[model samples]
Structures are given as structure tokens and as C-alpha cells.
Target: AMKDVLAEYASRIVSAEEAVKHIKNGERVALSHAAGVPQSCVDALVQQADLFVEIYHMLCLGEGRADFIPVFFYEVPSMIRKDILHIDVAIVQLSMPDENGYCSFGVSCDYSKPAAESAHLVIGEINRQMPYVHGDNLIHISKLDYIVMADYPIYSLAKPKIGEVEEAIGRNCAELIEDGATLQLGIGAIPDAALLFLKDKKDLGIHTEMFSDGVVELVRSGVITGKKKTLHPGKMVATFLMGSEDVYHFIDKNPDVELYPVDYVNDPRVIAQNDNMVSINSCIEIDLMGQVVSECIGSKQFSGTGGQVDYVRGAAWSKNGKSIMAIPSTAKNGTASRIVPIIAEGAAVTTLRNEVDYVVTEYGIAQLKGKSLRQRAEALIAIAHPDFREELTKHLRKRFG
Candidate 1:
């Protein structure tokens, strides 16, 4: 039986070039996010890019290489399943097959599993280095139409330096969190900064879209026991991961962490089941009306929707949930105010005014929910940088008076 399984696997094994040769002109191709994207396969596909129109991917990866379709990270699986975003070819990376001929989607499952299931053709890069993460992340070798053996380093992000402004903001966010609260945080300095103040808290839980090294430290320090979490108690639940090699090793085959598809992990209904949910996210700018601009800076796509709104709404629906948008008072080396009279022209509103609950800055925190427009302006100005307060007040009086 083992010999038979090996023969079947050997038959599907093909070179990267040959694997991508199956792609046709003008076909829609989709790629797995982050470190799970097939590098060799993508390189081979680019050699024949004259035939392809675009590739569907998330975050800000592979920019200029193809046109990325904007889709909420949580909805991508359903979109592909419903044929709203059809994929002719799906490229993904996986771990070597187990004794049963099953390959783990490894560090990434999120949309990759759904893409492989929905695509007309599936090409997998069997990376020898991909950590065998446990969850609903396994795909049998039989599911891959072609397999390309690969051995390359996965993607990793450098940790951001936490500055005074970031530390202050993180501290403000930490004050709002309860001992047993389930937290949802994205990558960057502010979110990581929030973790620093939470070291003394008791029984905090992680229910995030993505996490980096800060979480690893918390887990090691016994600060994140997750013992009181109402949902998935004592487990760290996430859809994807992006961190250092140490973090990869920490999650590899660790029973305490579970990686699920984005559709499940970020679904608001599923998140609401967790009591005392606290979702902390970052933003680029916020207008006086409390509209949030996170994904763009004047039409330049700086980031995607990701799971900010997903967790925001999820926390909103939770029994005692609190959603927070934390940012520095100034941007561009203190030249411009992040709390502006109005968002930059051509910048899209990633989160609406009505959906906002809390906006935190190094100066203070503003609870804008249920506040009048004038009250909202006053609240926002109070937390604005002192240098910009007078100017913001000038605009506030002109608009609200």
C-alpha cells in the first residue's frame, strides 16, 4: 500500500515550468497568501505572463506583477465557492505528504484551502521547509493536479520598533481590555505595543486574524493563558500567520494553536460567540465624522481590507465587545495630523462613521458611539495632538457651528 501511494505521488510530481504550462491564455489565476504562495510556480507563470490578464491575491504582496482584486479576507472563500470570483488556476504551497498521502497547507489555510477546492486546476509546490501546522489545513496529495518540489525560505516580517507615541496608544487600548477578554489585533507597532501593557493582566485570549512575535512572548510569559475565553478556550485561534522563523517554529505542530479558513475565523457570527471581545486595529486617517481610512492614502492602495472590519463588527456583536482604532496623533514626522478635518481626497472609507466605537491616540481615548456630530468633533479634538488641536478646533467650529 505504501508503494502504491508513492507511485501515485511520483506520477503527479512535475517541474515548476511544466506545472504552470497547464495554464492557458486569459485565464484567472489565484495565489495563496503570504509565505504559502508558490514561488517557483509564480516565476514560471510570469515567464508566460503575456497570456495571463491578472492574478487575484490579498494584502500588498505581488504588486505590479498582476492586477489584485479587492475582496474582504473573510469573504474570499465564499466568493470563489459561489463562482463570483472564479479561478481557472490556483497555486499554493504545502508540506510533504504524511504517511497517509495528505499534505498540510502548512502556515496558511485561510483562502488557500477554498481556492484549491474551487479552482479548475490546482498546482501545489511541496515545500520541504513549510512547518506542518495543524487544523483544517490538510489537503490530500490526490487533490493537487500537479506537484512541484520546492525548497525555499518562507516570507517573514521585521518587527516594528515601538516608540513613545505607539507605547502611549497601546497603553490606552490596554486600559479598555478586561482580564478575560478575547483580543483581535493586526500586525505593526501599535498592536504590538498594546501587548506590552497587558503583561500583568489575567487570562487574556487571542482571537485574531493575524499575529506576530509579540503573541509568542505573551504565550511564553503565561500572560495569555486563554483559560477564560468563552469560545475556543485555552486555544489561540487565527486564520493566517506572518512572523519570524522562531514564531514559525513555535506554531509548528503545536496543539495549542489552530489555523482555520478566513471565512470561519473572521466570520462575525462566529466571533460574537466569544464574550468580552476586544478588537484593536490601526488606521491611516480619520475624518471629523469618524470615518476611517485604512487601506489607502489618496487612492494609492497601501493595504487591503484584510480583517479590520470583520473583527470590528464581530466585536460589536459580541456580548461585551469593544472595538478600538488606535493611531498616533501625527503622521509624516509630525508635519500632518492623522485626526484630520476630513480624510484625504480620493481616499476610500474602509470603516464607516457609524461602525466606530472607540478611537485611541497617544493623547487620549475618544468614545464616539452615539455622540452627536458636534460632540464627536469635540471628542476627537481633545485627543488630537496639542499642536494640531487649535487648527482642528477651527475646522470643528466652522463645520458644526
Candidate 2:
């Protein structure tokens, strides 16, 4: 029966050139979600794309390949790019078909489902290794035609270094994380560092988008038991996974961590089901009016919108939940205050003033949720570095008056 399934799936596999032979010039193509980007298919697609073809995707956190050249663009709402693009053909990865002839999108479900619906043709890479995630991301086997069966390890993102500033910010941010609180953290040094500070805490749980190597220690030490969580009790719920080889090995065939689709994991209503949800995120800068700028550096595109807004709104609305924005007091060695008078020219505000509930810095924490403009400014200034307080205060007074 297993051989029959593999043979049936493999019969549909065609060479990358064969797959792209029908693609007309100037057509927009959408790759699979996150780690699901089929590199082998992409490699073949690049070889066939003699002319410039526009490829669109959300944030891809994996290797940089030739297929994603200048012609390829992203639908990054937060950061502005000169190239305009749209979804035409969606090439996705999935697990084996079930008894009902339905395939699972596996670990990632961020932007692929929407892209799949919008595309004219849908190509699927049905790998057996992909774990079946339950939710709104399933596709009936009848919907796909060009299914390619492959045997390979999925993509994995290495853990980045945790710097001194990130460690300090993490320590400060961790102070707000109460015992038995459910956490939603993004990927990077700040989240990694925050995990370092939680070694002594009790029964913290993870209900996040993606996790990294930082969570292993806590799970090993019994610090993250999910004992007080109301949703998915005793298990970690996530959409996708990326980390060192250690984390990959840990997750391989492990049932304790439930990997679901992004829509379900990032859904505010689902996040609200958990008690004491604490969402921790970072930002590039914040203005005196409590506006948050996370994706751009003076108009240049740095990162995509990702799931910051999704989780921020989720955490803010959750019962007894706290949406926190954490960053160092200054950047470039105290030369630039992260808490600035105004956002840099052309910077995009990823999180609006009202969405932000808490702001944390190495200096201290500033609660801004229901505070007025003047009050918000004052609270932010108090946590600003000592060197920049006077300047920030002067700007705050000028703006408020």
C-alpha cells in the first residue's frame, strides 16, 4: 500500500524544465511558504526562466537562491519596494495524501494558502516527511495535478548570536513574564536572550509562531511545563520551526510539540484561549507619540511584516494578556535613541500607538496602554537612557504644547 502511494505520487513528478515549459513570460509565480520553498524545483525553474519572471512571496527565512533574483519581489506591506508583483502560479510543498486523498501543507501556513487560492495553477511538492497539521490549510488531492515526490530534509534556520544589548533587553523584558504565563515570541537574539532569563521561572508555556534553540534548555529543565495553559495543555503549539540542528533533531518525530498552520497559531481568538498570554517583540525605533517602527531603516526595506501585528493584537485582546515591545535604549553606541522624537524619514510604523501595550528597554519598562499623548511621552522618557532623557523631554514638551 505504501509502495502504491509512492508510485502514484512519483508518477506525477516532472522535470523542472517540463514543469516551467508552460509558464509564459512575465507571469508572476508564488513559492511555497517559509521552509517549504522547494529548492530543487526552484533550481529547475531558474534554469528554465530565460527571461525575467516576477516571483512573489511573503518573508522567506531560508537560503538566498538565484531564482529569487531582482525580478522576484515580495508582498511586504510594511517596507516599500520599487518592484510591483502579484501571485500567478503557486508552487507549494505538502505531506503525503491521506486515505481521503487530501494533502497537508505541513508546518508552514503563513501566506501560502492565500497565494494558492489566488494562483491560476497550483503545483505541489508532496514530501512524506512533512507533518500533517490540522486546520484551514488542508488541500484535497483532487486539486493538485503537478505533484512531485521527493526525499530530502526540510529547510532549517540557524540560531543567531545573542548580543550584550539583546541580553540586557531580554532580562528587562523577562521581568514582566509572570509565572505560569503563556508566551508568544518572535525569532532573534532578543527572544533567545529572554529565554535565558526564564530558567528559574515556573511552568511557562510557548504558544508562538516559531521557536529556536533557546527553548530546549527550559524544556529540559522543566521550567516550561505548560501546566497552567488552557489551550493545548502540556504541549507547545507552533506554526513552523527553524533553529539549529539540535532543535531539528529534537522536533523530529516528537509529539510533545504540536506544529499547526499559521492561521490557527496566529489567530487572536485562539491565542486568547490561553491564560496570561505575553507577546514579546522588538522594534527598530519608537516615536514620542508611541508609534513603533520595526521593518525599515529610513525607507530602506529591512524585513517583512511577518506576524507582529497578528500576535500584538492577539496578546492585547487576550484576557490578562500583555503586548510588549522591547528594544535597547539607544542604537549605534548611545549615538541614536531608539525612543526618538519622531520616526526616521520614510520609516513605516509596523505597530500603531494604540496596539502597543508595554514598551521595555534596558533602562526600564514603560506602560503606555491607556495613557494620553503627554502621559505616554513622559512614561517613555523615563525609561530612555540618561544621556538622551533631556533631549527627549525637550522634544516631548515641544510636541505636546
Candidate 3:
């Protein structure tokens, strides 16, 4: 027998405009991100924008950007942190409640679970198109204080055409993957390129924060069976879903994939439990000492902290694990080396020298696992483009020699 939540909450349903009545001025509203965002809520919030002081958010995969407030935070890692996500109300979109009266977070679990739990008020936009994925993602309908009916196609991130340089970079990283290896592949060309070369590996599993369209094909081809995963054997564990509609339809009520909260998914302690864990992430720039900067370009906010450090440490802690950081050799049309003598002035470092393991480029791989500063510089410069290697090495001598 189902919980029959409709009997209780049906009367609570209101229009998006009507729902805005619950909000007040100077509240720190936390908006659900990606496809999990409610379009109407954003519209209503902005219509009543004067009531709010700050709208804390990241990755808005929805409609027009409203000039509400500055994007308060970027680190999904921080969303799970017990520090400063003091969300006054959590506005999220979701699939309608099931027969058991449970409405899953659908395409997202990320920090929504945490925001919802701590929030004084929780609002939902019930969308029929949203898939009901399982994991630690289920929330009973009784939990929602307000409801509105909304429908929209979930957002999709189309993969760009891979170039020769990117293909080689992907191949270099793919060569490191072995049979039965568990993967933490974040988004973009490098991650997608790496997935292309994994067609031959067997029983590979996903333990990433989120996955895009490339994973759907690998799963279809039987290359990602998840049969050998240690924590969730025969299951693909992710904290959220983002990709095309095909991938969304594939996950609809599917038992093979599970979505957990970001805190649990990005936790270094939990990630270390998987055997042969391999974390592949992108970086903005790196210096001679093996320091990695992924989030910013000289103090300007580029991206968030995300789970890079969490997974790097997790992979480092895992048994026979590998934590790899992949980046292009140069930026600005081959003008400057991304592998520089030192982090640029006003830039911030995401991964420290001590935590860095492997750095890869299209040219070759730089293994920095146990190497000293001098050794790390030499290895890193060696992988630089032939045009820049000599220059980088000269700087390396001055800094490390």
C-alpha cells in the first residue's frame, strides 16, 4: 500500500506566482542547479527579486539569467561542507511522487539533499518528465511544505567534436585504465575523449559526482558493466545525472544506476573504499612544483572547487589507486605554457604539490607521485609541447636546480 500523500499535499499545491508568497526579504535562497532547477520558481523569485538579498547557486542549466544577485558559491565541495551554505529555503524540481508517495530527486542529488534537510522551508516543482532514480535520493512527499506543477525537458550538455590534440590526450589517460577499474570521470573533452578509448576495458564502474552523454553509450556497449566494483558491484553510483534525453530516459526507473548525496559521493573516506579507484579531472593550470589550479584564472572565478581534491585524495588513499590530473600543454593558441615555472600572480591553487599524483598532456604523462620538486619539474616540462619544453626546462633549472 502506498503512503497516499496526494490526499494530504494536493490541497497544498499552488501556482509558481502563488508559491512566492512564502519568501521574504533578505533571505539567502538556494536554487537547485542543472536540470533539477525549477524554471517557474526562478521567474517568480526574480519577479519578487527585491525580497531576496543573495541567491546562492551554481550551474544553472535553465532559462534566461535573471539579474538577481551574484552567484554566491561555486564549489559543490563547499555545498556539502558544514561551513557556510546557510540556505533559507531550497527550491528544487522533481518527478511526481510514486505509488509509495516518494518523489526522488530525479536527475540530481548533489547538495540538494543537504539543502533540503537543513532548510526551514522546502519547495518543489513536480515535473512528469523527471526520472525517478534511486540511491540515497528518495524524499517523501510529506517533506515538501509547498508544491507547484511545472513541466519542461531536462537540460542536456552536448559533447563537442574532439580534436587531434584532445584525442591524443584522451588516449594517454585512457592507457592508464585497466580492467575492473572504477572511474571518477568529470565532464568535458578530456573526460569524453578518455571514455572513447575505454571501449575495450571490461567491468568498469562509475563512482563519479555526475556523468554526461558519453557514459550512456559505454553502458549500452557493455564496456561499463560495473560488475567488478567493490562498493556497489553491478551498479553505477553517481550523485547526479546530466546529459541528453536519451540518457535521462535510460535512467528512468532503471535499477542499474544509483544517485547519492554530494557529501557521501564526494567524501574522501567513502571514495577510498573502492579498489583500483581512478579519478580523472581537468585543470586550469599547473606550475613546476606540481601545484594545480583548476577553479580560477588569476583570482577571477572560472569554476568551483567541485570534488577535485576530494577524489584526488580518495584515489591516493585507495588500494592500488591512481589520481590523475589532465591538462592541455598550452593556453592562448600555443602562446604560453600551462606548465609554468610558478602559479601566476593573483591565481589560486586547487590541488597542492603534496597531493598531486599524475599530470598528463598530449605529449606524455608526468608521474609526480613520490618525486621531489626537482624531479616533478623535469617530468612536467618533458611533457610540454616541443616548442615550449626548452623554455620550461630553462625556467625549471633556475627554480629547482
Candidate 4:
């Protein structure tokens, strides 16, 4: 039977160019996220872009043109499964088959596995260099209609440099994370900076949507032991990852790390199961009312409604849970204050004022969960940039008095 399975796998092998021929015009094609992007197949598709009208993907990972779908990161799977969004073809990068003829989804398990499961055609690029990550992230060789050989290294995101502003914000956020707490951290400077101060904490657990290179050092130093995690003790859990080559190397076949689908990993009820859950995220702007704008600027979309609200609400339900929105006091070379009287016109409020917990800036942290509108405004203004503080207070006084 194993020999027959190998024979079937051999039969499905085809050139990348040939594999993409299965796509037709106006077909809804879904590409895997970030490092799990099938470069060879993508190049093959690019050669005949007219064959496919629109391609769907999350974030900015896929190459060529794509019709980015704005949805909750955790709900992508349900949408595909329920036929709310159908995928005619699912193109993904995967590791070479193991002894049992099952190939791993590699660094991406998020929506890629679900896409492949729900698509009419599954085209897989068997990348020799892809690390076989462990988790519920595997697919049988029979599931892939076409298999293309690829031997290139996956994409790598460079680690961001932490500045003084990020350092101060990180320190503020870090103080809220106690030993034995479960953390949900997003990507970029603020979360990475927060990790810098957590090296001294004991038994910190990761239950995040995604992680970069910052958690690696703590994991190596025994600081992030995950021993106190109530959900999956001693295991680091995430839906996906984007980090440097070194971070990739660190996760290669590591038993301690497991990647699962966002639908399961980011479910609010599931994340709430962990006690002392701390969710730290970033936003582009926040109004004095505690409204947050993270994905758009005046209705022009900058990012998707990812797992910010999911984990925010998740941490809200957890015992002793704390959700923090961290950012610098200013943006655009310090010319504009991030804390404003109101969010930009036409921009969707990513997080409502009622859901906000702690707001942090380089100056200090503002506790907003139970505070009134006037108190929230004053608290927000106190931590605002010095140049903008006076103007914010003037607006606050006019409204409150």
C-alpha cells in the first residue's frame, strides 16, 4: 500500500507551468500566506495572468496582483468552507513527503490547509528546503491534484530595529505581563520591543496569532518555558509566523512549537481558556474616546481586520486577562499626533471605545476599561506627545465643561 501511494504521488508530479494550466479565466484562486507562497507556481501563473481574473490572499504576502479580501483572520476558514468565498484553485508551498506520504504545510497552516481542503484543485509546490513543522498541518499526497518541484528557500522578513519610542512603549506593555501569563503578541516594533523586557519573567507562554524573531531569544534562554500554560502546557502555539532566516531555522522540526489554523487558534472562547491572558497589539491612531484605527486611513484600507479584536475580546473573558493597545505618541516623523480628538473621517473604528482596556504610549500607560469619557480623554491626553498635549486638553475641556 505504501508503494502504491508513492506510485500515485509520482504520477501527479508535473512542471509548474503545466500545473497552472488547470486554472481558467475568472476562477477565484487563493494563494498561501507569506513564506508558504508557492513561488514557482506563482511565476508560472504570472506567465499567463489573463487566465485568472482575481487572486485572493491575506496581508501583502502574495506576488503579482491580488484582490485582497478584508475579513477577520480567524474567519477565513469558515468563509471558504461555507462557500461564502469559493476557491477554484489553491496554490500553496509544502514540505516534501514524509515516510508516510503526508506532506507538511510548513511555516503556514493558517488558511492554506483550509483552502486546499475546500478548493476544486489543489496545486502544491514541494519545496525541498521547507522545514517540516509539526501540528495539525499535514495533507495526504493524494489530496494534491498537481505537484511541482521547488528547491528555493522561503521568503524571510527582516527584523525591525527597535527605537527609543518603541523601547518605552515596550517597557510600558511589559510591566503588565506577569510571570506564568499567556501572551498574544502581534508583529512589528512594539511587540518585539515588549519581548525585550520580558526576558526576566518566568514561564511565559505564547498563544499568539503570529510571531517574529523576538520570541526566539526568550525561548532559548528558558524564559518562555510555557510550563504554566493551562491550554497546551509546555507547547508554543501560533497560527503562522514571519521572521528572519534564523527564526525559521529555530522552528524547523522543533517539537515545542506547533502551528494550527487561525479559526481554531484565534477563537475567542479557546483563547479565553488560558488564565492571565495578555493581548498586546498596535494601532495607527486612537481617538480620545478610546476608539482605535489600525487597518485604514480615511476609508482607504491599510490592513485587514486581523485577530486584534478576537484576542482583545478573548483576553477580556480570561481570568485576570489584560488587553493593551500600544503605540508611539506620534507618527509621520513626529509631525502628527497619534492620539487625536477623533479618528480620521471615514476610517472604520477597528476597536470600539467600550472594548479598549489599557492604552500605552512612550510617555506612559492609560487605563481606560472602566473610566468615563472625560476621564479617558484626560488620561489619553496626559500620555500624548508634548507638542499635541495642549491642543488635546483644550478640546477635552471644551467637551467636558
Q: Residue 62: error of model 4 in Å? A: 11
Any runs in candidate 4 off by more than 4 Å, and if so which?
Answer: 1-8, 61-68, 296-305
lDDT of all predictions: 0.85, 0.73, 0.78, 0.85
Range of the 10 consecutive residues with the lowest summed lDDT in candidate 3:
296-305
Runs in model 1 lying further than 4 Å from the true structure: 1-7, 50-52, 61-70, 296-305
Model 3, position 237: C-alpha lDDT score: 88
lDDT per residue for candidate 3 within 1-401, as digits (tens), equals 86655576778798898887787777776766666777888888788776555666654222113432322222443643454556777888788898777888898787776777667788887887888887888888778889888778876767777887889889998899999999998667788899999998998998887887898899999999888888988888888778888889999888888998877787888888888898998777899889888653321222243467888988988888998888788888888777888787867677789999889999989899789888888899888888888888888777766
Q: How close is candidate 4 to the true structure, as a TM-score?
A: 0.94
Per-residue lDDT over 75-109 for candidate 4, one digit per residue giving the tens place of the 0 to 100 score:
88999999998999999889989888899888888
The TM-scores of all predictions, comma-separated, are: 0.94, 0.83, 0.90, 0.94
Model 1: per-residue Cα lDDT over 1-401, one tens digit each:
23654466788899998999888878888887776778899888888776654577775633212255666778889999999998988898998889888888887788888999889999989988888888788888888999999998788777888999999999999999989989999777888899999999999998888777998889999989889998889989988887888888898888888889999999999999989999998788998989998864322222354578899889999988999999989988899898999888877677889999999999999999999999999999999999999999999878877
184-218 in candidate 2: lDDT tens per residue?
A: 88667778888999988999998887666788668
Q: What's the count of clashing pairs in each model shown? A: 0, 0, 0, 0
